[PDB]
Amino acid sequence: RELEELSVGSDGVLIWKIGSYGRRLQEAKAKPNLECFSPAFYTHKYGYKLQVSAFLNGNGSGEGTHLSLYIRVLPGAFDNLLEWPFARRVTFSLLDQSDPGLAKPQHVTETFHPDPNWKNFQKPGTWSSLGFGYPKFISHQDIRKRNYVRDDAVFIRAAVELPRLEGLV
């Protein structure tokens, strides 16, 4: 799995394929506990370590009804060089897998300013490893409504909005 990470981490954009959706959703019905873990990924070179988890069958207020998406800060080798708490804006997306030439795909996208007072968005070392995000990201009804599920697979995107710092032209 160190290669899945090497292939992701660098520029704050994870794209995560979750395969065997139908099976995985059936097990999440049998174990409500069951969560999928993305590869860890870094917001920039020597940046924050982040991970994404998905509950195909929902968690908290969306248990049973929704796909639930969370993002989390992990202990990073470079934590002692970064500002805390984590405060970059995160943008979750579930990708509609329709050809973008043949039809501008309708993606489900949400953006949130992290909660400064969440035990996890502060520097690892302070006293939870839980996560933050959307328990009602998309409905079991709506997830089937387009190409969000194509080829028994789903695509979750997490983008750390870090804009370009340039001088005036």
């Binding site: 968690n59 908290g60 207020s61 248990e63 933050f132």
Partner: peptide, 10 residues
């Protein structure tokens, strides 16, 4: 069922 959920926004 039950859950130790992680925090959220609407």
């Amino acid at each position: 069922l039950r859950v130790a959920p992680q925090s959220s926004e609407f």
